[PDB]
Design goal:
globular; binds guanosine-5'-diphosphate; binds magnesium ion; Small_GTP-bd; ADP-ribosylation
Length: about 180
């Protein structure tokens, strides 16, 4: 079996841990975990190709800026996340996440992921953003950002509804295998 390491980064609350936890065989309600603390492994076949992806979660706060790089050694693919209900989280993609990842993970492919796709048409989300004269991120904005940062691809998903989640991890596996 081919062994690859994946790291997920992005602002706190943008859905990183939930995205990884969709893959987990075992589930544990009413426990909030800042990061996946167990050795969670994704088993993905890509055209008769048994690949095991170790999934590494990260803490996005500024307080962890000096310890977060402990997660980066020997990474094979990055999931770089923002959330579609948070224009601020997209702004931090070029300003914080891209230079940090390119520095610690040189030449490692980046999948840019827009999380919480279910919230784009959600009435409450629309109202909360609208009161500050904001709106959910549009797909064209994610595509434009993937171009600016040189990402391998841009994909949208919802850990809540599960839409797009498979594609994220299958594309991350395809990315990890090119090197
Ligand atoms: N509506 C919706 N909420 C989500 C989704 N993913 C995560 N959440 C919620 O967003 C909050 C933060 O998620 P979490 O995975 O802990 O974010 P992290 O800080 O990036 O790890 C939690 O309350 C989740 O229930 C999603 O796809 N859709
Ligand atoms: Mg988390």
């Amino acid at each position: 079996a081919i062994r690859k390491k994946l790291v997920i980064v992005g602002d706190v609350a943008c859905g990183k841990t939930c995205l990884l936890i969709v893959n987990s065989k075992d589930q544990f309600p009413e426990v909030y975990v800042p990061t996946v603390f167990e050795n969670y492994v994704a088993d993905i076949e890509v055209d008769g190709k048994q690949v095991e992806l170790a999934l590494w979660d990260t803490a996005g706060q500024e307080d962890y800026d000096r310890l977060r790089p402990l997660s980066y050694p020997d990474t094979d693919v990055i999931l770089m996340c923002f959330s579609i209900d948070s224009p601020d989280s997209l702004e931090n993609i070029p300003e914080k996440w891209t230079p940090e990842v390119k520095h610690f993970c040189p030449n490692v492919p980046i999948i840019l992921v827009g999380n919480k796709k279910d919230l784009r048409n959600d009435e409450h989300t629309r109202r909360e953003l609208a009161k500050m004269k904001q709106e959910p991120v549009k797909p064209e904005e994610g595509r434009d950002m993937a171009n600016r940062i040189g990402a391998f691809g841009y994909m949208e998903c919802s850990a809540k509804t599960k839409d797009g989640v498979r594609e994220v991890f299958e594309m991350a596996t395809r990315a990890a295998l090119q090197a």
